[PDB]
């Protein structure tokens, strides 16, 4: 899969993920949702090798949902990201590694803070104000470095994200067919249906 | 690396340089390549340093347990057999080249051991990148019924040849002397022919030279009680 | 063959009881009494040693109170050797959780894990159960201060105050009489020692026959601190509370 | 009491009663013998004709191991077959590694250790057979007899089964009367006689004689069955001696 | 040929007793007396060399064993069970500690490992408990000198002084009267010899007594020179002559 | 009463199966003796061939374990051969792994440890044998080490095993009480064998022919057994003084 | 008594009671007869029904084109042993291009049954088998007992009342052995033999089961109206 | 492709008079791309400090592994692990993965609580110990650090002088390495106080 | 390496050079390639020094255990144990071994085991890199039932030529004589054999 972006603002985390699924010669789909809800206040977007991406995401989703039922409690975003990192770090020395890069956007209900975690297929974890995987950061980070403020509203975060996507649409060779955008805050997860 | 071993009148002696190099850079200028196996059994290690050290420690541990079990002082042939069988099992993947020497109830012994598990018996041996330089000295001056004073001289001369003429070897000379009916004497830094000269200048900075963003105290203590 | 000699440790009686569990509990009833009391600002663990000897080196001795991590401790009643096998397993589970999630293990999760291990020995394997009852004293950010007990059956329950070992019937009546919900640690310390002093089979309760510990939120600057009491410190608290 | 209910339990005497009970199964079986001769060994066995419906010469009891060892046994016949199957595996692996065919003393210990192993655990039953076996190796002729306990010794003559006392007495006469030794062809004749004499203990049913032999001069050191004219000559000799 | 005892041979009786552990303790009680005394600057462990025959060479039978250079052990009960425990204890000191940390384990942790092995024979399938109580004396840098007892159950307790086996009840009463916290090692050896004389019937000399100490570092026993940090073993077994010298000042 | 059937503790702290294995030891009704010279270790054992049908050359309770080590067994032959095969396997493995010949006392310890396991583990029975190992060890010199079903072992100056062991033991005890040394002060092994046979004759009160005895001799770098004609030469020398 | 709790235990007189109890299951089973000449070998089996609504339990199982058996006792144990025979016959054909000798088939069944009599946990097989076959040495008939004992015979019978048939075959021995190149007469002799073991019941069309193998005859089973000829 | 230089970064440790110093840069990258300027490479277990350079997933994994092991050590030993003992634990742990190693360059720094002796050590990826008196270097600019340290270092520096020496060694080494920089941290460690200082440096 | 074994009237003689090389460097100039697996069963080793030493040590263990159980093994038995190890592990071994031994029954026997792990019983055998240069010489000069002195000369002259032409061979010529009389070691120095 191609472009996955993340930006943590004042009171929410915004994840933007491309809609295209290309199998070599043809674009098979232009409405693909590259994300799974792990818990009510934690969302994970993903990109990497075909098959492995969804298999990994759903496997993580199942384990976090299992934890939620057992303890009657939602794990913090930090705890979920550490669990995800360990599974990827375990994977890299396997017989056949998961080639999957993820962003984990969550709202910590205890601390009342949005949190964004970037984890690559090796199990390299970093907490960031904004992040990306693959070539997405090469185009967008100069704009984010310039315009980003920690006290941005959700609407300002979306406007900065539009500028990032516009720059991607201008300079990237591949047609990624636009992005699905989702917001993670104190009220949970919702999709921005017009972008 | 230059390591050497040779036998004399009523003993055996080991020699080694003290330089560890990864690629072209000197990682360590004073490392110990003469390894302890038993009180009177020692091992010079060449090749991959971690492997040589690890293999001597494992066999040294097993030799100690064997010695306790049998109520006998360990033999060099036991250390030799255990090392070669271990190294053979790993088909050279443990890249240890060793010179094993010691004294035991049987007498004094000197063996070499290669990474694939072949062993040799010798009166004088050398291993490592400096082996050819060291062996030139041993072939020139080694003789039968050497005295201890002559043997230490020859062993250190063999290691020096490696130090000066091999880029892989350098720094100081370590020696270990194992004589019959005596405690083994481990002579670390037996020779020190490569002390650095005094520098031209002092590079100590004025205080406040470095720019600092933040200062904080790190709490390294257990949680306190009130 | 071998069948002849098998006691069959994991079977029901005609009444639907697990023989070996019931007999393990009988063993535990002869062990030194351990008491746990939970307060608003901390937990107390008090326990009586059965050594009863002058030459025993008390300051380096540990038979009753063990540390599982920085936030959780246990009081032991039963076979000490059996308890140490389980304690080491619990210590590993806590560190596994910390490695996986980067957060200290919640108290109940640790308790459930150990209790599940005990349960397994009663249902399969043909081995004798662990002759151990634990009092778990711990803290986490979800439920705060918590007391639990587990027994050889693998059943565990939560408590405000509880006893295990000898004279638990008598001990639980005394705790039920004087415990209140708004109680503080200093009051709970006094209750635990007074209860042991009345239920003890010994002629008098002294410092050399006790192990004592507190978990108090009230480490400098809002952190939780475990305090395993030294012999001299047990002697002082006995004089303070007016028992010696 | 209860010491006899489980194999590998020592009684207060220091006895393994389950092994002693296996001996009773051996004592209940048909008579089998072995005779050591000058350059080889002869084996013979009594086969009870339970009925006319048994096909003559078909239910062969003596078994070969490798090409040079003969085995015969008395007691539980399936147990004897199981032991010979093991013996064949032991002889095959010996020859695989060391090239030379298994020597007889070596082979004896392979069977011995295996039988002895079945007295070490309560999860197995001891062997209900005594096995007489032997042959020719590089050091000459060897005859052995192996009991349910795992015990074995070398023999000049050996006998086991229901008629063992009778047979043993006859073997003891041959040893005394022939210190210089007995020829292979003589031993075949004498083996026939001894089985016929030992048949007084099983006199109710009639029987069938079966003989085999290994001899350096007569069989090139290979195990062979005595057949046809040589077998009939031995039967005639035996029939003449009883009358 | 299969091991079918996969079930516990030690089980709880209706009264809450673990029979096989109690019976193992009875075997320890029949065993020859051994003791341990802790001083300020050392520990002493001692026992009687009960020779089964005068033709036997009792020097070849070591009741007092080195476990590590700074830790020693003695027992009461079944000798063969002790010997195999010493083998396992020496090996576990290497595999679960020295090969990881590059140093010998402290006394309490090696004891913990021995205790674990003994506990497992009390719960695992198809085995009986060990019929020995051990007394383990040792030194380490951070804990100093220490003395531990280990029972068939796997339980262990630290002692200032104690005795186990035949005459342990009388011996422990003797040690309570004599022990204080200001004893030097030579005083503890003297008390050990006095205590042990009461439980010995026959000959009482260096050839019939086995005695070892955990004391000062012995660089003479190390076997090599040239490493300042290695100063030699604190465990030392007293000779037959060394014991007889102290029996004159008795 | 299943505490008498398997190796678990009785209420007295005893292992009855171990005690009964000791009784199996004397089932052969054979007495053995071992003594040490200056340069050698001699072991003698009674040889009884009750059946005339037996091949007397194959009747033996002395085993050549390795070149340097010999072993005599007191107990039934199946267990004797079980112990013999294992000791041979252990001696060969030792030499392969550690590069020198297995010492007599170390083999004894190893076999004793194996015997200890059968007293602790339920599924394995003890072997009903007492094993007496002999050698001239390269470090310790002449050596006798004996193992039993309890897993006990110890070194000996001299030893005796069998039904009449006490009579032999006391005879040997009395000799060493006179001489005040740990061995037979004699140069040749031939005379040490003559001592061994003489003191067994005195202790048991029976005369021996060449076929009534079995002899094993350990010297430096080899252990060997004497033939009937070697023993006969020994018996002639005894009678001639 | 005390020594019949498992197969691993000898009695004081050297008997294996579990094996003898397995032998008893065969005596309760329905009668089956085996007999042969030099050219052919025949099995005749009296099948048993549960009641008048039920089918008659099959007694004969084909193992190969040249071999097969009849059973008496526990039918599931016959299924296990016949399946093992099928595999050994098949192994011989696939690996060696060789038809398995009937004598060697008996040796394999003996050894398989033996292992169950010497080990803890298992039980003896509770079935008796009569194996017929035609191989390179002509016609053969075997009797298998679950003790392990396998016996080569001219004729025999096993099951309830089998002694009547076995006595008849003992008398007729000299006659039926000579029935060469005449399959119908050999079957007649087998049907006449099994009739000596009948009481109250007689041989009907769905009661009788016959099998035959011979020189130029593959192992074939006859049931139903195919055996009406011989009633 | 080379696992030890994908993420980049450096660690240096030095001894002084009654003190030790350990320092590291803050960069984490994906080759040319700078990803994080807050990736600290120094961790501590009681009073023992561990710096780790190399592949970042292994840096995180080994930290979590040694936290695990030193926590269990403390519970069993009833005391904090010492630098000398921890060094052997790092070496053991790395060598057990001999044929599938962690791609890292660890550095140990600390003061022995009983003797008061300053201690530093470095390792290769399979656990070979370099126990230097003077200084230890590690990471993608280890050559540059060797050059700085070998000239700038002198023995027995006071804590506040040692701070200047180690800081200037790190900074100028990092400025000659593409894959290091983006901030820096220096720990000054004394027997019972530890000061942590973030340095100001060029952000390219 | 230059190795050979030669049967003669009184028994067998094994012969070898003493050079061990790592490329063109002589790692050991006084190697003993004549190795003892039993009292009167020896072998000559060629190929991987690690492999042939590992094999020879295992064989020595097998024959020691054989001897404890079954008495003295034949030379054929020793060759068979060598073959079993070489043949079954042919994919992971580079070993060329000549086995030579003396029985009283069979007298002197020689077996050669080349790379594949096949066995060939021969009156004499040559092997190692230097043996290529003396196939012609050895074939022309070998006779059956030579004396001890003739056989020593034959081996000395043969290995002298092998050493002369092969860079991988050199040093001293070691020999081991196996007869009823016992085991005799011989050594021949360069100044002796070079002038032949
Ligand atoms: Cl052992
Ligand atoms: Mg047992
Ligand atoms: Mg830079
Ligand atoms: Mg830049
Ligand atoms: Mg040349």
From Swiss-Prot, chain C:
SMART domains: Proteasome_A_N
Coiled coil: none
Record keyword ATP-binding present: no
Principal location listed in the UniProt entry: cytoplasm
Top-level taxon of the source organism: Eukaryota
Chain residue numbers at which the record places covalent cross-link Glycyl lysine isopeptide (Lys-Gly) (interchain with G-Cter in ubiquitin): 99, 198, 230
Entries under InterPro entries matching the protein: Ntn_hydrolases_N, Proteasome_alpha, Proteasome_alpha-type, Proteasome_asu_N, Proteasome_bsu_CS, Proteasome_sua/b
GO cellular component assignments: cytosol; nucleus; proteasome complex; proteasome core complex, alpha-subunit complex; proteasome storage granule
Annotated GO biological process: proteasomal ubiquitin-independent protein catabolic process; proteasome core complex assembly; proteasome-mediated ubiquitin-dependent protein catabolic process
Localization per record: Cytoplasm; Nucleus
Keywords for the protein's UniProt record, in alphabetical order: Cytoplasm, Isopeptide bond, Nucleus, Proteasome, Ubl conjugation
Nucleus is among the record's keywords: yes
UniProt miscellaneous comment: Present with 17100 molecules/cell in log phase SD medium.
Family that this chain belongs to: Belongs to the peptidase T1A family.
Subunit structure: The 26S proteasome consists of a 20S proteasome core and two 19S regulatory subunits. The 20S proteasome core is composed of 28 subunits that are arranged in four stacked rings, resulting in a barrel-shaped structure. The two end rings are each formed by seven alpha subunits, and the two central rings are each formed by seven beta subunits. The catalytic chamber with the active sites is on the inside of the barrel.
Alphabetized NCBIfam families for the sequence: PRK03996.1
Record-given protein name: Proteasome subunit alpha type-3
Organism name: Saccharomyces cerevisiae (strain ATCC 204508 / S288c) (Baker's yeast)
Classification of source organism: Eukaryota, Fungi, Dikarya, Ascomycota, Saccharomycotina
Name of the encoding gene: PRE9
From Swiss-Prot, chain D:
Modifications the protein undergoes after translation, according to the UniProt entry: The alpha and beta forms are probably products of the same gene with different post-translational modifications.
Location relative to the cell: Cytoplasm; Nucleus
Highest taxon in the source lineage: Eukaryota
Keywords for this protein: Acetylation, Cytoplasm, Nucleus, Proteasome
One GO molecular-function entry: mRNA binding
GO cellular component, one term: proteasome complex
GO biological process assignments: proteasomal ubiquitin-independent protein catabolic process; proteasome-mediated ubiquitin-dependent protein catabolic process
Oligomeric and partner information: The 26S proteasome consists of a 20S proteasome core and two 19S regulatory subunits. The 20S proteasome core is composed of 28 subunits that are arranged in four stacked rings, resulting in a barrel-shaped structure. The two end rings are each formed by seven alpha subunits, and the two central rings are each formed by seven beta subunits. The catalytic chamber with the active sites is on the inside of the barrel.
Note: Present with 12000 molecules/cell in log phase SD medium.
Record-stated family: Belongs to the peptidase T1A family.
Protein name: Probable proteasome subunit alpha type-7
High-level lineage: Eukaryota, Fungi, Dikarya, Ascomycota, Saccharomycotina
Gene name as annotated: PRE10
From Swiss-Prot, chain E:
InterPro entries in UniProt: Ntn_hydrolases_N, Proteasome_alpha, Proteasome_alpha-type, Proteasome_asu_N, Proteasome_sua/b
One of the GO BP terms on file: proteasomal ubiquitin-independent protein catabolic process
Gene Ontology CC annotations of this record: nucleus; proteasome complex; proteasome core complex, alpha-subunit complex; proteasome storage granule
Pfam families the UniProt entry points to: Proteasome, Proteasome_A_N
Transmembrane segments: none
Cell membrane in keyword set: no
UniProt keyword terms in alphabetical order: Cytoplasm, Isopeptide bond, Nucleus, Proteasome, Ubl conjugation
SUPFAM superfamilies reported for this sequence: N-terminal nucleophile aminohydrolases (Ntn hydrolases)
Extra remark: Present with 7060 molecules/cell in log phase SD medium.
Quaternary organization: The 26S proteasome consists of a 20S proteasome core and two 19S regulatory subunits. The 20S proteasome core is composed of 28 subunits that are arranged in four stacked rings, resulting in a barrel-shaped structure. The two end rings are each formed by seven alpha subunits, and the two central rings are each formed by seven beta subunits. The catalytic chamber with the active sites is on the inside of the barrel.
Protein known as: Proteasome subunit alpha type-2
Organism of provenance: Saccharomyces cerevisiae (strain ATCC 204508 / S288c)
Taxonomic lineage: Eukaryota, Fungi, Dikarya, Ascomycota, Saccharomycotina
Swiss-Prot record, chain H:
InterPro entries (UniProt xref): Ntn_hydrolases_N, Proteasome_beta_3, Proteasome_bsu_CS, Proteasome_sua/b, Proteasome_suB-type
Keyword Cytoplasm: yes
Coiled coil location: none
GO cellular component: cytosol; nucleus; proteasome complex; proteasome core complex, beta-subunit complex
Single GO molecular function: endopeptidase activator activity
UniProt keyword annotations, A-Z: Cytoplasm, Isopeptide bond, Nucleus, Phosphoprotein, Proteasome, Ubl conjugation
One Pfam family named in its UniProt record: Proteasome
Phosphoserine modified-residue sites: 30
Localization per record: Cytoplasm; Nucleus
Major place of residence: cytoplasm
GO annotation terms (biological process): proteasomal ubiquitin-independent protein catabolic process; proteasome-mediated ubiquitin-dependent protein catabolic process
UniProt-listed PROSITE patterns: PROTEASOME_BETA_1 (PS00854), PROTEASOME_BETA_2 (PS51476)
Glycyl lysine isopeptide (Lys-Gly) (interchain with G-Cter in ubiquitin) cross-link, renumbered residues: 69
Gene3D superfamilies per record: Glutamine Phosphoribosylpyrophosphate, subunit 1, domain 1
Alphabetized CDD domains for the sequence: proteasome_beta_type_3
Function text: Non-catalytic component of the proteasome which degrades poly-ubiquitinated proteins in the cytoplasm and in the nucleus. It is essential for the regulated turnover of proteins and for the removal of misfolded proteins. The proteasome is a multicatalytic proteinase complex that is characterized by its ability to cleave peptides with Arg, Phe, Tyr, Leu, and Glu adjacent to the leaving group at neutral or slightly basic pH. It has an ATP-dependent proteolytic activity. This subunit may participate in the trypsin-like activity of the enzyme complex.
Family: Belongs to the peptidase T1B family.
PANTHER family: METALLOPROTEASE TLDD, PROTEASOME SUBUNIT BETA TYPE-3
């Amino acid at each position: 899969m191609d472009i996955i972006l993340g930006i943590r603002v004042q009171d929410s985390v915004i994840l933007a993920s491309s809609k295209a699924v290309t199998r070599g010669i043809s674009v098979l789909k232009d409405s693909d949702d590259k994300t799974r809800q792990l818990s009510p206040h934690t969302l994970m977007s993903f990109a990497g090798e075909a098959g492995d991406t969804v298999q990994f995401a759903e496997y993580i989703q199942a384990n976090i949902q299992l934890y939620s039922i057992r303890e009657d409690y939602e794990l913090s975003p930090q705890a979920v990201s550490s669990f995800v990192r360990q599974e990827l770090a375990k994977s890299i020395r396997s017989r056949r590694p998961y080639q999957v890069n993820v962003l984990i956007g969550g709202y910590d209900k205890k601390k009342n803070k949005p949190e964004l975690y970037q984890i690559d297929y090796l199990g390299t974890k970093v907490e960031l104000p904004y992040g990306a995987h693959g070539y997405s950061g090469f185009y967008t980070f100069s704009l984010l470095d310039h315009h980003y403020r920690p006290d941005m509203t959700t609407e300002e975060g979306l406007d900065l994200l539009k500028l990032c996507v516009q720059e991607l649409e201008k300079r990237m060779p591949m047609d990624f067919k636009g992005v699905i955008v989702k917001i993670v805050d104190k009220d949970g997860i919702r999709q921005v249906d017009d972008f | 690396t230059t390591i050497a071993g040779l036998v004399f009148q009523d003993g055996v002696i080991l020699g080694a340089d003290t330089r560890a190099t990864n690629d072209s850079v000197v990682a360590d200028k004073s490392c110990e390549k003469i390894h302890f196996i038993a009180p009177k059994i020692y091992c010079c290690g060449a090749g991959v340093a971690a492997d040589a050290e690890a293999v001597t420690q494992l066999i040294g541990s097993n030799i100690e347990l064997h010695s306790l079990y049998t109520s006998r002082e360990p033999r060099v042939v036991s250390a030799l057999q255990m090392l070669k069988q271990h190294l053979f099992k790993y088909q050279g993947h443990i890249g240890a080249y060793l010179i094993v020497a010691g004294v035991d109830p049987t007498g004094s012994h000197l063996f070499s051991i290669h990474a694939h598990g072949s062993t040799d018996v010798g009166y004088y041996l050398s291993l490592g990148s400096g082996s050819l330089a060291a062996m030139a000295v041993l072939e020139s001056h080694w003789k039968q019924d050497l005295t201890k004073e002559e043997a230490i001289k020859l062993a250190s001369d063999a290691i020096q040849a490696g130090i000066w003429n091999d880029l892989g070897s350098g720094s100081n000379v370590d020696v270990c002397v194992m004589e019959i009916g005596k405690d083994a004497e481990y002579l670390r830094n037996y020779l020190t022919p490569n002390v650095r000269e005094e520098k031209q200048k002092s590079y100590k900075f004025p205080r406040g030279t470095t720019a600092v963003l933040k200062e904080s105290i790190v709490n390294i203590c257990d949680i306190q009680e009130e | 063959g071998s069948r002849r000699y098998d006691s069959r440790t994991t079977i029901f009686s005609p009444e639907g009881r697990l023989y070996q569990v019931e007999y393990a509990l009988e063993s535990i009833s002869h062990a030194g009494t351990a008491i746990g009391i939970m307060a608003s600002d901390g937990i107390v663990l008090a326990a009586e040693r059965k050594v009863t000897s002058t030459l025993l080196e008390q300051d380096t001795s540990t038979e009753k109170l063990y540390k599982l991590n920085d936030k959780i401790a246990v009081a032991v009643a039963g076979l000490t050797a059996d308890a140490e096998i389980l304690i080491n397993t619990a210590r590993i589970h806590a560190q596994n959780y910390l490695k996986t999630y980067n957060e200290d293990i919640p108290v109940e999760i640790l308790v459930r894990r150990l209790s599940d291990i005990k349960q397994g020995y009663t249902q399969h394997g043909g081995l004798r159960p662990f002759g151990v009852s634990f009092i778990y004293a711990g803290y986490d950010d979800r439920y705060g201060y918590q007391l639990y007990t587990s027994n050889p059956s693998g059943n565990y329950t939560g408590w405000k105050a509880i006893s295990v070992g000898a004279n638990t019937s008598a001990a639980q009546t005394l705790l039920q009489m004087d415990y209140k919900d708004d109680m503080k640690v200093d009051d709970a310390i006094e209750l635990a020692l007074k209860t042991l002093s009345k239920t003890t089979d010994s002629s008098a309760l002294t410092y050399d026959r006790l192990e004592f510990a507190t978990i108090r939120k009230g480490a400098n600057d809002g952190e939780v601190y475990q305090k395993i009491f030294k012999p001299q410190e047990i002697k002082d608290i006995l004089v303070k509370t007016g028992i010696t | 009491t209860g010491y006899d209910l489980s194999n590998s339990v020592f009684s207060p005497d220091g006895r393994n009663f389950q092994v002693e009970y296996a001996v009773k199964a051996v004592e209940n079986g048909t008579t089998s013998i072995g005779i050591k001769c000058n350059d080889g060994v002869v084996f013979a066995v009594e086969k009870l004709i339970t009925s006319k419906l048994l096909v003559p010469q078909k239910n062969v009891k003596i078994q070969v191991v490798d090409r040079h060892i003969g085995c015969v046994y008395s007691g539980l016949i399936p147990d004897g077959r199981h032991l010979v199957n093991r013996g064949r595996e032991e002889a095959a692996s010996f020859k695989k590694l060391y090239k030379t065919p298994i020597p007889i003393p070596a082979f004896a210990d392979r069977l011995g250790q295996y039988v002895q192993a079945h007295t070490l655990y309560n999860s197995v039953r001891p062997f209900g057979v005594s096995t007489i076996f032997g042959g020719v190796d590089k050091n000459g002729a060897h005859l052995y007899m192996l009991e349910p306990s795992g015990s074995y010794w070398g023999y000049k003559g050996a006998a086991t089964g229901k008629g063992r006392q009778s047979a043993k007495a006859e073997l003891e006469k041959l040893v005394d009367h022939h210190p210089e030794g007995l020829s292979a062809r003589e031993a075949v004749k004498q083996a026939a006689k001894i089985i016929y004499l030992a048949h007084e203990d099983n006199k109710e049913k009639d029987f069938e004689l079966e003989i085999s032999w290994c001899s350096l001069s007569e069989t090139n050191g290979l195990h062979k069955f005595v057949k046809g004219d040589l077998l009939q000559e031995a039967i005639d000799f035996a029939q003449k001696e009883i009358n | 040929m299969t091991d079918r005892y996969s079930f516990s041979l030690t089980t709880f009786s209706p009264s809450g007793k673990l029979g096989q552990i109690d019976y193992a303790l009875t075997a320890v009680k029949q065993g020859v007396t051994s003791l341990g005394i802790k001083a300020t600057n050392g520990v002493v462990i001692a026992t009687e060399k009960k020779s089964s025959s005068p033709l036997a060479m009792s020097e070849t039978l070591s009741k007092v064993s080195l476990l590590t250079p700074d830790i020693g052990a003695v027992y009461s009960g079944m000798g063969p069970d002790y010997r195999v425990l010493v083998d396992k204890s020496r090996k576990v000191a290497h595999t679960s500690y020295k090969r990881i940390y590059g140093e010998y384990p402290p006394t309490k942790l090696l004891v913990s490992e021995v205790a674990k092995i003994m506990q497992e024979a009390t719960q695992s399938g198809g085995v009986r408990p060990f019929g020995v109580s051990l007394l383990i004396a040792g030194h380490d840098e951070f804990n100093g000198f220490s003395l531990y007892q280990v029972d068939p159950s796997g339980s262990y307790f630290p002692w200032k002084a104690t005795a186990i086996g035949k005459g342990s009840v009388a011996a422990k009463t003797f040690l309570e009267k004599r022990w204080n916290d200001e004893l030097e090692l030579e005083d503890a050896i003297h008390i050990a010899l006095l205590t042990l004389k009461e439980s010995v019937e026959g000959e009482f000399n260096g050839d019939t007594i086995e005695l070892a100490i955990i004391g000062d570092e012995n660089p003479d026993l190390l076997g090599y020179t040239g490493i300042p940090t290695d100063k030699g073993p604190r465990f030392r077994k007293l000779t037959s002559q060394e014991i007889n010298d102290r029996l004159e000042a008795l | 009463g299943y505490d008498r059937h398997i190796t678990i503790f009785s209420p007295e702290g005893r292992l009855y199966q171990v005690e009964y294995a000791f009784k199996a030891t004397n089932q052969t009704n054979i007495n053995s003796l071992a003594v040490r010279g200056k340069d050698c270790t001699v072991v003698i054992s009674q040889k009884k061939v009750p059946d005339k049908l037996l091949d007397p050359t194959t009747v033996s309770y002395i085993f050549c374990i390795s070149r340097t080590i010999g072993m005599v067994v007191n107990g039934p032959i199946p267990d004797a051969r079980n112990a013999a095969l294992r000791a041979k396997a252990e001696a060969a493995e030792f030499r392969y792994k550690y590069g020198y010949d297995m010492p007599c006392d170390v083999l004894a310890k190893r076999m004793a440890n194996l015997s200890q396991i059968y007293t602790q583990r339920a599924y394995m029975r003890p072997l009903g044998v007492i094993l007496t190992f002999v050698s001239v060890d390269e470090e310790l010199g002449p050596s006798i080490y004996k193992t039993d079903p309890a897993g006990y072992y110890v070194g000996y100056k001299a030893t005796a095993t069998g039904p009449k062991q006490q009579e032999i033991t006391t005879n040997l005890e009395n000799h060493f009480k006179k001489s005040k040394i740990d061995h037979i002060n004699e140069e040749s092994w031939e005379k040490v064998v003559e001592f061994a046979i003489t003191h067994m004759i005195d202790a048991l009160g029976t005369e021996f022919s060449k076929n009534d005895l079995e002899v094993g001799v350990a010297t430096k770098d080899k252990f060997f057994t004497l033939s009937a004609e070697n023993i006969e030469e020994r018996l002639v020398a005894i009678a001639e003084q | 008594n005390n020594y019949d709790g498992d197969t691993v235990t000898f009695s004081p007189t050297g008997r294996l009671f579990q094996v003898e109890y397995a032998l008893e299951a065969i005596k309760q089973g329905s009668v089956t007869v085996g007999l042969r000449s030099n050219t052919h070998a025949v099995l005749v089996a009296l099948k048993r029904n549960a009641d008048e609504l039920s089918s008659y339990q099959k007694k004969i199982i084909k193992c190969d084109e040249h071999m097969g058996l009849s059973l008496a006792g526990l039918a599931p144990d016959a299924r296990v042993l016949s399946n093992y025979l099928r595999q050994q016959c098949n192994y011989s054909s696939l690996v060696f291009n060789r038809k398995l000798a009937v004598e060697r088939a008996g040796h394999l069944l003996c050894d398989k049954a033996q292992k169950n009599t010497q080990s803890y946990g298992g039980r003896p097989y509770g079935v008796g088998l009569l194996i017929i076959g035609y191989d390179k040495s002509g016609a053969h008939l075997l009797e298998f007992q679950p003790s392990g004992n396998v016996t080569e015979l001219y004729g025999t019978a096993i099951g309830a009342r089998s002694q009547g048939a076995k006595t008849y075959l003992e008398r007729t021995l000299d006659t039926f052995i000579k029935i060469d190149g005449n399959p119908d007469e050999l079957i007649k002799a087998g049907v006449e033999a099994i009739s000596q073991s009948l009481r109250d019941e007689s041989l009907t069309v769905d009661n009788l089961s016959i099998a035959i193998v011979g020189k130029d005859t593959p192992f074939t089973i006859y049931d139903g109206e195919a055996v009406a000829k011989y009633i | 492709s080379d696992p030890s230089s994908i993420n980049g970064g450096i660690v240096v440790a030095m001894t002084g008079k009654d003190c030790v110093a350990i320092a590291c840069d803050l960069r984490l990258g994906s080759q040319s791309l700078g990803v994080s300027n807050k990736f600290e490479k120094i961790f501590h277990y009681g009073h023992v400090f561990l710096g780790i350079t190399g592949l970042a997933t292994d840096v995180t994994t080994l930290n979590e592994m040694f936290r695990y092991k030193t926590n269990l050590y403390k519970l069993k030993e009833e005391r904090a692990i010492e630098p000398e003992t921890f060094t052997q634990l790092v070496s053991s742990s790395l060598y057990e993965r001999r044929f599938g190693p962690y791609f890292v360059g660890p550095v140990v720094a600390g003061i022995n609580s009983k003797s008061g002796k300053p201690f530093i050590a470095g390792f290769d990826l399979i656990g070979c110990i370099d126990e230097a008196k003077d200084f230890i270097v590690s990471g993608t600019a280890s050559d540059q650090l060797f050059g700085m340290c070998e000239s700038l270092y002198e023995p027995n520096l006071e804590p506040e002088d040692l701070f200047e020496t180690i800081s200037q060694a790190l900074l100028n080494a990092a400025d000659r390495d593409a894959l290091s920089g983006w901030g820096a941290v220096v720990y000054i460690i004394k027997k019972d106080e530890v000061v942590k200082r973030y340095l100001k440096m060029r952000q390219d | 390496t230059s190795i050979m074994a030669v049967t003669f009237k009184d028994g067998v003689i094994l012969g070898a050079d003493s050079r061990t090389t790592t490329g063109a460097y002589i790692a050991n100039r006084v190697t003993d390639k004549l190795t003892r697996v039993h009292d009167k069963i020896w072998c000559c080793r060629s190929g991987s020094a690690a492999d042939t030493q590992a094999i020879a040590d295992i064989v020595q263990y097998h024959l020691e255990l054989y001897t404890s159980q079954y008495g003295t093994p034949s030379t054929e038995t020793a060759a068979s144990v060598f073959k079993e190890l070489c043949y079954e592990n042919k994919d992971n071994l580079t070993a060329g071994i000549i086995v030579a031994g003396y029985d009283d029954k069979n007298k002197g026997e020689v077996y050669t085991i080349p790379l594949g792990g096949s066995v060939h019983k021969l009156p004499y055998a040559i092997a190692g890199s230097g043996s290529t240069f003396i196939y012609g010489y050895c074939d022309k000069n070998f006779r059956e039932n030579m004396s001890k002195e003739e056989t020593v000369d034959f081996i000395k002259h043969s290995l002298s030529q092998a050493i002369k032409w092969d860079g991988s061979s050199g040093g001293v010529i070691r020999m081991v004589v196996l007869t009823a009389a016992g085991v005799e070691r011989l050594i021949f120095y360069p100044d002796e054999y070079e002038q032949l």
